[PDB]
Design an enzyme around this catalytic site. Sequence first.
Site, short mmCIF file in Angstrom:
data_model
loop_
_atom_site.label_atom_id
_atom_site.label_comp_id
_atom_site.label_asym_id
_atom_site.label_seq_id
_atom_site.Cartn_x
_atom_site.Cartn_y
_atom_site.Cartn_z
N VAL A 33 0.79 -1.21 0.00
CA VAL A 33 0.00 0.00 0.00
C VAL A 33 0.84 1.29 0.00
O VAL A 33 0.29 2.38 0.00
CB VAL A 33 -0.99 0.02 1.20
CG1 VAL A 33 -1.98 -1.22 1.15
CG2 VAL A 33 -0.19 0.20 2.53
N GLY A 34 2.17 1.17 -0.02
CA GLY A 34 3.01 2.35 -0.12
C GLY A 34 4.38 2.19 0.51
O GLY A 34 4.84 1.09 0.79
N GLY A 36 7.22 5.47 2.14
CA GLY A 36 7.50 6.49 3.14
C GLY A 36 8.96 6.91 3.11
O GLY A 36 9.28 8.05 3.43
N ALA A 37 9.82 5.97 2.72
CA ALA A 37 11.28 6.16 2.67
C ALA A 37 12.00 5.28 3.69
O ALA A 37 13.14 4.87 3.48
CB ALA A 37 11.68 7.62 2.87
N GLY A 39 10.83 2.42 4.56
CA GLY A 39 10.47 1.06 4.22
C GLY A 39 9.15 1.04 3.48
O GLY A 39 8.59 2.09 3.16
N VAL A 41 5.14 -0.75 3.40
CA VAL A 41 4.15 -1.37 4.27
C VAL A 41 3.10 -2.12 3.46
O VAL A 41 2.69 -1.67 2.39
CB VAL A 41 3.47 -0.33 5.20
CG1 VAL A 41 4.15 1.02 5.09
CG2 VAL A 41 1.99 -0.22 4.88
N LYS A 56 5.10 -3.15 8.49
CA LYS A 56 6.15 -2.31 7.90
C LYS A 56 7.49 -3.04 7.93
O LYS A 56 7.95 -3.41 9.00
CB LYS A 56 6.29 -1.02 8.69
CG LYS A 56 7.06 0.07 7.97
CD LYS A 56 7.51 1.09 8.98
CE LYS A 56 7.14 2.51 8.60
NZ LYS A 56 6.86 3.30 9.84
N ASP A 171 2.98 8.55 14.08
CA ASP A 171 4.25 9.05 13.58
C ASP A 171 5.13 9.72 14.63
O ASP A 171 5.19 10.94 14.75
CB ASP A 171 4.02 9.98 12.39
CG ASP A 171 3.53 9.24 11.15
OD1 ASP A 171 3.61 7.99 11.13
OD2 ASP A 171 3.07 9.91 10.19
#
Length: 355
Positions: A33-34, A36-37, A39, A41, A56, A171
């Site tokens: 699903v994406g 982030g930089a 890793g 997830v 993740k 976060d």
Amino acid sequence: MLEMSQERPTFYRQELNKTIWEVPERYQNLSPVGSGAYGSVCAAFDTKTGLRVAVKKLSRPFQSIIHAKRTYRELRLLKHMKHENVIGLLDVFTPARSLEEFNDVYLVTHLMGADLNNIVKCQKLTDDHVQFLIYQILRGLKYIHSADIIHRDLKPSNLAVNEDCELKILDFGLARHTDDEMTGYVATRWYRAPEIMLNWMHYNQTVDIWSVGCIMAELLTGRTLFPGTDHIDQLKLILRLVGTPGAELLKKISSESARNYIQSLTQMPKMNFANVFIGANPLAVDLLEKMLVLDSDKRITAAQALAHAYFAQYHDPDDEPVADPYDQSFESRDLLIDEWKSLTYDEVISFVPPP
């Protein structure tokens, strides 16, 4: 009464979008699903708890002193959070059977439905909606601050919200924003307390309350409170509303360049919030006044804010808990890569699942 060994579950492998995933059988139907930089997830079903979760796989986590320390920092923070309104850690694992083989770290958390931006785009929020969302943010902040943890980057995008208007703060760990990321007309800076936007002084808990202030104002007006095109434009927007600093505040500004700069600005009085937030619940207006105070020393705290009449429907002093102490000595400690990696490994395998 005690328990002296641990059962290593069975793992299975698979390639998902260019990369390998080695997870416990437990976790099923993984779907990317994406990123982030830090890793990528996957969403997955945790058959053992019946929860939809986010898995993740950290990316090159022990690449350098700095990254290895980031990794450790994030694992320590997430392991610590045990509160309804704060993201907790559901599970953490590595396929490695020894420290010698240790390379990858996987982090499991609740799959998040939507964040505050998603919520705000799909509908208009009532006053009561705002009462409840802000109360929860402050309930989580009380907890966070109890342990002398500074979130430091509160934002709508860092606030998950579900179909029942229940909220969690997300976060934490995270690689600090770079200078370029904080440059220009960007949401990454609009919620920042001025003390840390321009590095006036050494910052603390209080910066989070300024952020809550900006968020609350936005939820009531439907507009970004201080949408500056750059650091300086943003400062002007703030001093416009909140007034140029008086004498006591100027003193607390370590940097003499900042001091000299501030003074070069035509002075201005606080504006009347009642006329800025026209039509808003007068209790919200009063609260904002107590949150958006330029001098950080005189900002209302989370604990006090929870007692504010605006949250009368939700306040309950017996249901607003505090955290166990959080030891942060490691932030001041200098170690080698393999030493952060070993500390991290020790934290992975010592994880205790929730009840």
